[PDB]
Symmetry: D2
Subunit: 24 residues, 4 copies
Amino acid sequence: GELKAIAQELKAIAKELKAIAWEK
Amino acid sequence: GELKAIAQELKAIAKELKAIAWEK
Amino acid sequence: GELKAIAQELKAIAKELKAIAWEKKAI
Amino acid sequence: GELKAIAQELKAIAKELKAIAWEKKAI
Ligand SMILES: [N+]
Ligand SMILES: [N+]
Ligand SMILES: [N+]
Ligand SMILES: [N+]
C-alpha cells in the first residue's frame, strides 16, 4: 500500500543521490 | 562517498517501511 | 538546487509518515 | 513509535543534504 509507494520513492531518491555523487 | 552512504541509508529505510506495512 | 529539492521531498515524506503513524495510532 | 523515529531520521537526512548542497555551492 501507501508505505510500499513511499519505500519506492526513497529507492528512487537513493538512485538520484548516487547519480549526483558521480557528476554534480 | 557521503551521498552514496546516504543513498544506502534510504534503501535501508525503504526496507523497514515495507516490513512495517506487512505487519505493524 | 537538486539536493535542496530532494531535502524538501524527504521532509515532506517525514510529515506523511507521521500522518500515517498517527492514523494507525488513532484507529 | 518506529514510523515516528523514521520520520526524524528523514528530516535529519534532509538537513545533512542541505549542508552538503551548501558546502558544494560555497566551494
Ligand atoms: N526526486
Ligand atoms: N531506520
Ligand atoms: N512524497
Ligand atoms: N543520517
